[PDB]
């Protein structure tokens, strides 16, 4: 409350650490369904069904241009990529599996880096 603050967590390395995580996600072999925006002209159903499309290249651009106010907003877009994947793809598909694997990978780097 007013004039009463918890001690100040050092957030000065967050930008760089999120960038490193994203790099590791970009270079994982199962990243291929997630590198670029889904083509909304060529994938029937995507536009109508998926309200908030997200992919790694779009996250990379938001990061580089100061569009994430804090590390939580960045984690929300990453998660959104996998939540979208789950919404549109059967668990027992190459893309469905890729999604589950990438999410597991992300959540571990996230915990090890920040918790």
Curated annotation (Swiss-Prot):
It comes from the Eukaryota. Residues 9-113 form the Bromo domain. Expressed at varying levels in several tissues, whereas a smaller transcript was expressed specifically in testis. It is found in: Nucleus. Regulatory subunit of the ATP-dependent BRF-1 and BRF-5 ISWI chromatin remodeling complexes, which form ordered nucleosome arrays on chromatin and facilitate access to DNA during DNA-templated processes such as DNA replication, transcription, and repair. Both complexes regulate the spacing of nucleosomes along the chromatin and have the ability to slide mononucleosomes to the center of a DNA template. The BRF-1 ISWI chromatin remodeling complex has a lower ATP hydrolysis rate than the BRF-5 ISWI chromatin remodeling complex. Component of the BRF-1 ISWI chromatin remodeling complex, at least composed of SMARCA1 and BAZ2B, which regulates the spacing of histone octamers on the DNA template to facilitate access to DNA. Within the BRF-1 ISWI chromatin remodeling complex interacts with SMARCA1; the interaction is direct. Component of the BRF-5 ISWI chromatin remodeling complex, at least composed of SMARCA5/SNF2H and BAZ2B, which regulates the spacing of histone octamers on the DNA template to facilitate access to DNA. Belongs to the WAL family. This is Bromodomain adjacent to zinc finger domain protein 2B. It comes from Homo sapiens (Human). The gene is BAZ2B.
């Amino acid at each position: 409350s007013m004039s009463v603050k918890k001690p100040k967590r050092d957030d000065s390395k967050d930008l760089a650490l999120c960038s490193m995580i994203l790099t590791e996600m970009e270079t994982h072999e199962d990243a291929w369904p997630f590198l670029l925006p889904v083509n909304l002209k060529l994938v029937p159903g995507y536009k109508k069904v998926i309200k908030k499309p997200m992919d790694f290249s779009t996250i990379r651009e938001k990061l580089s241009s100061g569009q994430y106010p804090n590390l939580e907003t960045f984690a929300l877009d990453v998660r959104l990529v996998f939540d979208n994947c789950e919404t549109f793809n059967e668990d027992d598909s190459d893309i469905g599996r890729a999604g589950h694997n990438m999410r597991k990978y992300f959540e571990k780097k996230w915990t090890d880096t920040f918790k």
